[PDB]
Amino acid sequence: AAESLPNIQIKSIAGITEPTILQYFATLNAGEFAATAALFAVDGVMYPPFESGIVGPDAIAAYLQQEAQGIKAEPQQGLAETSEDGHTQVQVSGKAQTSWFGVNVLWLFTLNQEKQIIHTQIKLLASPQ
Amino acid sequence: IQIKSIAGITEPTILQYFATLNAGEFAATAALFAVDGVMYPPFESGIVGPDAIAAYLQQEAQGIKAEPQQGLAETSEDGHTQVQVSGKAQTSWFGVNVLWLFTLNQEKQIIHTQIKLLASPQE
């Protein structure tokens, strides 16, 4: 039963190989929001668009279950850079979308030395000109 | 005395924007814009055209530096380029984390730019 193909098949996409970033999008898109929340540090912060920051895996999981239904993430490219303090700064561009409409966005992440998410934000990007 | 930076954007117009800003060469910053390109300062109305953009920067951007860190770019089918650069706007000794958004036309002139403030705290 459990001995079978797993979930969240982690495939490198969006030009980023950071495991935590690949797992974030894979778990989100499978609706495995507990697993998404578990990628955050004990005091990691998720900033939903237009909302106050949500702190910690338990509150993040509950937010995603209540508010992220029917939203798929489609990353197209990304870049990760490691700073002097040992953290990793990630940018990912792509689309957030439903079955028939969506929006261009930028996902931003900062990871700690253990590669947990310390905080993430989503920024909107209107279509050109 | 203009000095380039380092990030995920090799685009000359983008590199030039930050270098001319940091040098206080605000007429040259403004010249990177199209004749009807628009600059949106963080909480302000759009300023249209190199003449108005140069005068705004000379008035309100003195002593402000840009330290871009990394960026992404996408080109659409019509030939426009969208650029996102994250970094800090800062003075000699204090700053804030920001995201610069640009749209470039086919000729790589700035059509649009704006600044978005990013999160600084930890509640």
mmCIF file of C-alpha atoms in Angstrom:
data_model
loop_
_atom_site.group_PDB
_atom_site.id
_atom_site.type_symbol
_atom_site.label_atom_id
_atom_site.label_comp_id
_atom_site.label_asym_id
_atom_site.label_seq_id
_atom_site.Cartn_x
_atom_site.Cartn_y
_atom_site.Cartn_z
ATOM 1 C CA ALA A 1 0.000 0.000 0.000
ATOM 2 C CA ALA A 2 2.468 2.645 1.191
ATOM 3 C CA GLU A 3 5.075 0.650 -0.787
ATOM 4 C CA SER A 4 4.328 2.429 -4.128
ATOM 5 C CA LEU A 5 5.075 5.562 -6.186
ATOM 6 C CA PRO A 6 5.215 8.484 -3.696
ATOM 7 C CA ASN A 7 3.577 11.931 -3.944
ATOM 8 C CA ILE A 8 5.292 15.280 -4.680
ATOM 9 C CA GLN A 9 7.541 13.748 -7.415
ATOM 10 C CA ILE A 10 10.330 16.303 -7.101
ATOM 11 C CA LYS A 11 11.390 17.274 -10.629
ATOM 12 C CA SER A 12 13.785 20.174 -11.255
ATOM 13 C CA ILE A 13 11.794 22.988 -12.931
ATOM 14 C CA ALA A 14 11.794 26.812 -13.098
ATOM 15 C CA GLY A 15 15.617 26.750 -13.350
ATOM 16 C CA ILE A 16 16.121 26.099 -9.584
ATOM 17 C CA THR A 17 17.446 22.934 -7.992
ATOM 18 C CA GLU A 18 17.067 23.914 -4.307
ATOM 19 C CA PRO A 19 15.222 20.904 -2.803
ATOM 20 C CA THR A 20 13.123 23.048 -0.428
ATOM 21 C CA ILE A 21 11.925 25.242 -3.293
ATOM 22 C CA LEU A 22 11.100 22.274 -5.524
ATOM 23 C CA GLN A 23 9.198 20.650 -2.633
ATOM 24 C CA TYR A 24 7.261 23.863 -1.872
ATOM 25 C CA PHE A 25 5.700 23.985 -5.329
ATOM 26 C CA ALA A 26 5.227 20.219 -5.599
ATOM 27 C CA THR A 27 3.432 19.897 -2.249
ATOM 28 C CA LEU A 28 1.324 23.004 -2.889
ATOM 29 C CA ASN A 29 0.168 21.705 -6.253
ATOM 30 C CA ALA A 30 -0.796 18.314 -4.822
ATOM 31 C CA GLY A 31 -2.771 19.982 -2.040
ATOM 32 C CA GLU A 32 -0.405 18.478 0.555
ATOM 33 C CA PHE A 33 -0.477 21.662 2.605
ATOM 34 C CA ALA A 34 0.714 20.070 5.851
ATOM 35 C CA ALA A 35 3.825 19.052 3.910
ATOM 36 C CA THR A 36 4.130 22.611 2.528
ATOM 37 C CA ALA A 37 3.869 24.094 6.022
ATOM 38 C CA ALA A 38 6.454 21.584 7.271
ATOM 39 C CA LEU A 39 9.087 23.165 5.015
ATOM 40 C CA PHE A 40 8.981 26.285 7.216
ATOM 41 C CA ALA A 41 11.115 26.908 10.283
ATOM 42 C CA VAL A 42 9.440 26.855 13.698
ATOM 43 C CA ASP A 43 8.998 30.631 13.381
ATOM 44 C CA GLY A 44 8.827 30.838 9.579
ATOM 45 C CA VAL A 45 6.471 33.442 8.105
ATOM 46 C CA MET A 46 4.192 33.150 5.091
ATOM 47 C CA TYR A 47 2.958 36.466 3.671
ATOM 48 C CA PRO A 48 -0.165 35.850 1.562
ATOM 49 C CA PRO A 49 -0.887 38.638 -0.908
ATOM 50 C CA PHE A 50 -2.750 41.521 0.781
ATOM 51 C CA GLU A 51 -2.627 39.872 4.232
ATOM 52 C CA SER A 52 -0.705 39.852 7.501
ATOM 53 C CA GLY A 53 2.181 37.432 7.911
ATOM 54 C CA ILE A 54 1.284 33.961 9.218
ATOM 55 C CA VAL A 55 3.803 32.408 11.612
ATOM 56 C CA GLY A 56 4.695 28.749 12.055
ATOM 57 C CA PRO A 57 3.881 25.455 10.334
ATOM 58 C CA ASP A 58 0.558 24.916 12.155
ATOM 59 C CA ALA A 59 -0.922 28.308 11.268
ATOM 60 C CA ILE A 60 0.488 28.145 7.729
ATOM 61 C CA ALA A 61 -1.069 24.713 7.145
ATOM 62 C CA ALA A 62 -4.432 25.962 8.410
ATOM 63 C CA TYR A 63 -4.224 29.048 6.200
ATOM 64 C CA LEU A 64 -3.458 27.017 3.069
ATOM 65 C CA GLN A 65 -6.305 24.565 3.747
ATOM 66 C CA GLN A 66 -8.740 27.454 4.198
ATOM 67 C CA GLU A 67 -7.541 29.852 1.489
ATOM 68 C CA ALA A 68 -5.371 28.133 -1.155
ATOM 69 C CA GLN A 69 -7.911 25.646 -2.512
ATOM 70 C CA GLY A 70 -8.138 25.539 -6.282
ATOM 71 C CA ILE A 71 -4.908 27.526 -6.804
ATOM 72 C CA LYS A 72 -2.051 25.910 -8.732
ATOM 73 C CA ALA A 73 1.465 27.289 -8.895
ATOM 74 C CA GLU A 74 3.222 27.199 -12.270
ATOM 75 C CA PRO A 75 6.823 28.347 -11.805
ATOM 76 C CA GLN A 76 8.665 29.155 -15.031
ATOM 77 C CA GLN A 77 12.171 30.169 -13.851
ATOM 78 C CA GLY A 78 14.076 30.887 -10.676
ATOM 79 C CA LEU A 79 17.385 31.810 -9.116
ATOM 80 C CA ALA A 80 18.897 31.153 -5.698
ATOM 81 C CA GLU A 81 21.832 33.037 -4.185
ATOM 82 C CA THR A 82 23.597 32.338 -0.878
ATOM 83 C CA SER A 83 24.443 35.366 1.282
ATOM 84 C CA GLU A 84 27.277 35.920 3.756
ATOM 85 C CA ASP A 85 25.140 34.984 6.769
ATOM 86 C CA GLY A 86 24.536 31.477 5.314
ATOM 87 C CA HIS A 87 20.995 32.186 4.121
ATOM 88 C CA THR A 88 19.704 31.582 0.588
ATOM 89 C CA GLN A 89 17.673 34.236 -1.250
ATOM 90 C CA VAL A 90 15.356 32.764 -3.890
ATOM 91 C CA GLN A 91 13.314 34.431 -6.619
ATOM 92 C CA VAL A 92 10.840 32.463 -8.747
ATOM 93 C CA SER A 93 8.646 33.899 -11.495
ATOM 94 C CA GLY A 94 5.586 32.246 -12.992
ATOM 95 C CA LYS A 95 1.814 32.024 -12.816
ATOM 96 C CA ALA A 96 -0.715 31.377 -10.063
ATOM 97 C CA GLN A 97 -3.878 30.058 -11.624
ATOM 98 C CA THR A 98 -7.209 28.282 -11.414
ATOM 99 C CA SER A 99 -8.659 25.984 -14.047
ATOM 100 C CA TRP A 100 -9.350 28.939 -16.343
ATOM 101 C CA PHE A 101 -7.730 32.175 -15.119
ATOM 102 C CA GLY A 102 -4.542 33.307 -13.454
ATOM 103 C CA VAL A 103 -1.988 36.022 -12.769
ATOM 104 C CA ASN A 104 1.755 36.581 -13.231
ATOM 105 C CA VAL A 105 3.644 36.636 -9.929
ATOM 106 C CA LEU A 106 7.018 36.600 -8.246
ATOM 107 C CA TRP A 107 7.563 34.168 -5.356
ATOM 108 C CA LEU A 108 10.284 35.255 -2.937
ATOM 109 C CA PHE A 109 11.859 32.996 -0.335
ATOM 110 C CA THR A 110 14.591 33.223 2.251
ATOM 111 C CA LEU A 111 16.007 29.913 3.562
ATOM 112 C CA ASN A 112 18.149 29.423 6.641
ATOM 113 C CA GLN A 113 21.347 27.372 6.769
ATOM 114 C CA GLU A 114 19.327 24.175 7.263
ATOM 115 C CA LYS A 115 17.338 25.152 4.100
ATOM 116 C CA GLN A 116 14.041 25.706 5.958
ATOM 117 C CA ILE A 117 11.864 28.605 4.844
ATOM 118 C CA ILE A 118 12.281 31.602 7.161
ATOM 119 C CA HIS A 119 9.831 33.651 5.138
ATOM 120 C CA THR A 120 8.088 33.771 1.806
ATOM 121 C CA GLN A 121 6.127 36.460 -0.035
ATOM 122 C CA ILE A 122 4.198 36.646 -3.294
ATOM 123 C CA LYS A 123 4.352 39.849 -5.327
ATOM 124 C CA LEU A 124 2.070 40.701 -8.252
ATOM 125 C CA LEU A 125 3.352 41.636 -11.757
ATOM 126 C CA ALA A 126 0.852 43.126 -14.203
ATOM 127 C CA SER A 127 1.073 42.294 -17.903
ATOM 128 C CA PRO A 128 3.472 44.544 -19.847
ATOM 129 C CA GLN A 129 2.539 48.158 -20.610
ATOM 130 C CA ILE B 1 32.084 57.965 -11.689
ATOM 131 C CA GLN B 2 29.379 55.398 -12.573
ATOM 132 C CA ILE B 3 30.008 51.828 -11.340
ATOM 133 C CA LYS B 4 27.996 48.733 -12.396
ATOM 134 C CA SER B 5 26.557 46.205 -9.877
ATOM 135 C CA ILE B 6 26.142 42.368 -9.898
ATOM 136 C CA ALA B 7 22.871 40.365 -10.221
ATOM 137 C CA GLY B 8 20.853 37.928 -12.396
ATOM 138 C CA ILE B 9 20.227 40.607 -15.089
ATOM 139 C CA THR B 10 22.804 41.237 -17.839
ATOM 140 C CA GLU B 11 20.424 43.783 -19.484
ATOM 141 C CA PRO B 12 22.476 46.958 -20.141
ATOM 142 C CA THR B 13 19.535 49.332 -19.553
ATOM 143 C CA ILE B 14 18.874 47.766 -16.136
ATOM 144 C CA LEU B 15 22.535 47.814 -15.142
ATOM 145 C CA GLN B 16 22.698 51.470 -16.275
ATOM 146 C CA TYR B 17 19.613 52.492 -14.275
ATOM 147 C CA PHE B 18 21.209 51.516 -10.981
ATOM 148 C CA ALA B 19 24.699 52.786 -11.772
ATOM 149 C CA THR B 20 23.488 56.241 -12.844
ATOM 150 C CA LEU B 21 21.200 56.487 -9.801
ATOM 151 C CA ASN B 22 24.071 55.629 -7.482
ATOM 152 C CA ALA B 23 26.252 58.256 -9.153
ATOM 153 C CA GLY B 24 23.577 60.939 -8.764
ATOM 154 C CA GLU B 25 23.489 61.199 -12.574
ATOM 155 C CA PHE B 26 19.733 61.592 -12.644
ATOM 156 C CA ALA B 27 19.505 63.158 -16.096
ATOM 157 C CA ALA B 28 21.208 60.036 -17.462
ATOM 158 C CA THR B 29 18.861 57.807 -15.411
ATOM 159 C CA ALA B 30 15.888 59.609 -16.931
ATOM 160 C CA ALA B 31 17.305 59.350 -20.445
ATOM 161 C CA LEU B 32 16.963 55.537 -20.227
ATOM 162 C CA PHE B 33 13.181 56.006 -20.342
ATOM 163 C CA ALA B 34 11.055 56.193 -23.455
ATOM 164 C CA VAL B 35 9.546 59.563 -24.358
ATOM 165 C CA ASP B 36 6.358 58.513 -22.525
ATOM 166 C CA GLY B 37 7.869 56.068 -20.028
ATOM 167 C CA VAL B 38 6.498 56.267 -16.491
ATOM 168 C CA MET B 39 8.320 56.070 -13.155
ATOM 169 C CA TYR B 40 6.262 55.273 -10.049
ATOM 170 C CA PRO B 41 7.983 56.348 -6.816
ATOM 171 C CA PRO B 42 6.855 54.180 -3.895
ATOM 172 C CA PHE B 43 3.794 56.079 -2.644
ATOM 173 C CA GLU B 44 3.521 58.678 -5.394
ATOM 174 C CA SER B 45 1.800 59.375 -8.691
ATOM 175 C CA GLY B 46 3.449 58.257 -11.907
ATOM 176 C CA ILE B 47 5.981 60.663 -13.411
ATOM 177 C CA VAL B 48 6.003 60.564 -17.222
ATOM 178 C CA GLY B 49 8.937 61.418 -19.470
ATOM 179 C CA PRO B 50 12.681 61.941 -18.990
ATOM 180 C CA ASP B 51 12.343 65.661 -18.242
ATOM 181 C CA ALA B 52 9.829 65.183 -15.428
ATOM 182 C CA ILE B 53 11.595 62.051 -14.146
ATOM 183 C CA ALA B 54 14.968 63.818 -13.978
ATOM 184 C CA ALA B 55 13.445 66.741 -12.057
ATOM 185 C CA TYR B 56 11.672 64.402 -9.621
ATOM 186 C CA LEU B 57 14.867 62.424 -8.936
ATOM 187 C CA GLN B 58 16.903 65.604 -8.450
ATOM 188 C CA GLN B 59 14.302 66.727 -5.903
ATOM 189 C CA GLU B 60 13.458 63.533 -4.024
ATOM 190 C CA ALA B 61 16.184 60.921 -4.614
ATOM 191 C CA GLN B 62 19.283 62.778 -3.416
ATOM 192 C CA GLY B 63 21.421 60.646 -1.141
ATOM 193 C CA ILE B 64 19.514 57.445 -2.009
ATOM 194 C CA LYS B 65 21.471 54.486 -3.358
ATOM 195 C CA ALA B 66 20.370 51.205 -4.917
ATOM 196 C CA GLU B 67 22.091 47.914 -4.081
ATOM 197 C CA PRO B 68 20.514 45.383 -6.443
ATOM 198 C CA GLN B 69 21.245 41.779 -5.511
ATOM 199 C CA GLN B 70 19.544 39.394 -7.947
ATOM 200 C CA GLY B 71 16.941 39.479 -10.680
ATOM 201 C CA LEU B 72 14.822 37.684 -13.254
ATOM 202 C CA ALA B 73 13.715 38.645 -16.739
ATOM 203 C CA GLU B 74 11.061 37.449 -19.202
ATOM 204 C CA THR B 75 10.517 38.468 -22.824
ATOM 205 C CA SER B 76 6.998 38.234 -24.230
ATOM 206 C CA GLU B 77 6.066 37.586 -27.855
ATOM 207 C CA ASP B 78 5.510 41.277 -28.635
ATOM 208 C CA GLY B 79 9.182 41.944 -27.795
ATOM 209 C CA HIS B 80 8.661 43.553 -24.384
ATOM 210 C CA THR B 81 10.875 42.516 -21.477
ATOM 211 C CA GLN B 82 9.776 42.300 -17.850
ATOM 212 C CA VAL B 83 12.507 42.530 -15.192
ATOM 213 C CA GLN B 84 12.280 42.030 -11.423
ATOM 214 C CA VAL B 85 15.262 42.929 -9.238
ATOM 215 C CA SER B 86 15.435 42.479 -5.497
ATOM 216 C CA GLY B 87 17.849 44.436 -3.288
ATOM 217 C CA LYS B 88 17.990 47.408 -0.924
ATOM 218 C CA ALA B 89 17.396 51.128 -1.303
ATOM 219 C CA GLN B 90 19.571 52.823 1.225
ATOM 220 C CA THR B 91 21.435 55.892 2.445
ATOM 221 C CA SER B 92 25.026 55.841 3.743
ATOM 222 C CA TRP B 93 23.916 53.921 6.838
ATOM 223 C CA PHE B 94 20.287 52.746 6.697
ATOM 224 C CA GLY B 95 18.130 51.016 4.095
ATOM 225 C CA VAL B 96 15.055 48.921 3.271
ATOM 226 C CA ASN B 97 14.490 45.705 1.323
ATOM 227 C CA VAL B 98 12.725 46.406 -1.959
ATOM 228 C CA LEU B 99 11.757 44.944 -5.296
ATOM 229 C CA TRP B 100 12.224 47.004 -8.486
ATOM 230 C CA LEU B 101 9.905 46.155 -11.383
ATOM 231 C CA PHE B 102 10.701 47.223 -14.927
ATOM 232 C CA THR B 103 9.077 46.904 -18.297
ATOM 233 C CA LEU B 104 11.251 47.500 -21.353
ATOM 234 C CA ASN B 105 10.146 48.100 -24.902
ATOM 235 C CA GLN B 106 11.654 46.388 -27.940
ATOM 236 C CA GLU B 107 14.375 49.072 -28.092
ATOM 237 C CA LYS B 108 15.189 48.331 -24.407
ATOM 238 C CA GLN B 109 13.977 51.730 -23.161
ATOM 239 C CA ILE B 110 12.204 51.764 -19.802
ATOM 240 C CA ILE B 111 8.427 51.977 -20.401
ATOM 241 C CA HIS B 112 7.497 51.518 -16.745
ATOM 242 C CA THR B 113 9.173 51.084 -13.415
ATOM 243 C CA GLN B 114 7.953 50.870 -9.853
ATOM 244 C CA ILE B 115 9.230 49.966 -6.395
ATOM 245 C CA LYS B 116 7.592 47.539 -3.996
ATOM 246 C CA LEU B 117 8.549 47.342 -0.337
ATOM 247 C CA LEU B 118 9.326 43.844 0.910
ATOM 248 C CA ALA B 119 8.953 42.428 4.435
ATOM 249 C CA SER B 120 11.499 43.621 7.057
ATOM 250 C CA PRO B 121 10.071 42.095 10.396
ATOM 251 C CA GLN B 122 9.520 38.836 12.268
ATOM 252 C CA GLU B 123 6.365 38.713 14.286
#
